[PDB]
Amino acid sequence: SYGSRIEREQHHLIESIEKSTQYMAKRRIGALISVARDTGMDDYIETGIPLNAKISSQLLINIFIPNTPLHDGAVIIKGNEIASAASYLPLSDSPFLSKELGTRHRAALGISEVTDSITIVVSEETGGISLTKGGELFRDVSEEELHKILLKELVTVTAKKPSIFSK
Ligand SMILES: [Cl-]
Numbered sequence: 523s524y525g526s527r528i529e530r531e532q533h534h535l536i537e538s539i540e541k542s543t544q545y546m547a548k549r550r551i552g553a554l555i556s557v558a559r560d561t562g563m564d565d566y567i568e569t570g571i572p573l574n575a576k577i578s579s580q581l582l583i584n585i586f587i588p589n590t591p592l593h594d595g596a597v598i599i600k601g602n603e604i605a606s607a608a609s610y611l612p613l614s615d616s617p618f619l620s621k622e623l624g625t626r627h628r629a630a631l632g633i634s635e636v637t638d639s640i641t642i643v644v645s646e647e648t649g650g651i652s653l654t655k656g657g658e659l660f661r662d663v664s665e666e667e668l669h670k671i672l673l674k675e676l677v678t679v680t681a682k683k684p685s686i687f688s689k
Contacts (some may be wrong), residue, residue, distance in 0.1 A: 525686030529679040531602045535577055536672045543644050543651050544665065552593075552628045552646030553586040556611060557676060558600040561637035567598050570609030577604055586644075596629065596641075612636065619659065621639035623652075630654040640675050641669075 525587055539555060546553050556563065559665045571592060577599065585607050594610035600638035614631035623645075634654035643652045650662035653671055660671065679688070 526602065527684045527686060528688050529677070529684065531684075532613060532679065535599070536669075538577050538579045538582060539642060539672060540665070541579035543642055543668070546577070546586060546644045547584050547649040547651055550646060550649045551588065551644065552624070552626055553582075553644040554596040554611070554630060554641065555582065555643075556596050556598050556604075556609075556630070556633055556639050556641040557568055558598060559638045559640065559675075561639060563598055563600060563633075563639060564576070566596070566611060566633070567600060567606045567607050570595060570598065572606050573604050575604045577602065580629055582604050588646075596633075611641075614657075614682030616657075620661075624663075627652060627654075627659065631657070631659055634658070640672075642648040 526618060543553060581604060582597065584596055587593055591608040596611045597604055598606050598609050611629040612632040613625065613628045614635055619628060619631055624647060626643045630643045631654050633639055633641055635657045638656065641654045651668055652662060653660045655675065
């Protein structure tokens, strides 16, 4: 009703990502979701359509429906908001990334090389879910694996007293 609890926000974020990518994976809908961390991704947010929207699995799903305005490019999540959709991300020039993979994977690898962001990709070809962080690709991960990486990398707080002031 006034302020929010950081631990609740971070767990809602992970749940929203899990539910939306699972929905899109079953239907082979391509998706690209980059979560900003310590590194400013403000330049890339400015390349997309600004949303500044509450995070939900439903919005994330509606964003990536093919042949819609918002689906062509990356969603960037920053703070507790979906900041932009249809954003540009730089492509990796790595020759080690397999040629079986698509341009969404190349964009997720590219941003992972120059930011500490965590990027999730759903393949429009296969429905496989992948993640990138720090120039590394985790390819075709299971739901358990996705859950544990997202838990490790996106929740900062352990069990402590909830408070709208902890931030
Ligand atoms: Cl809350």
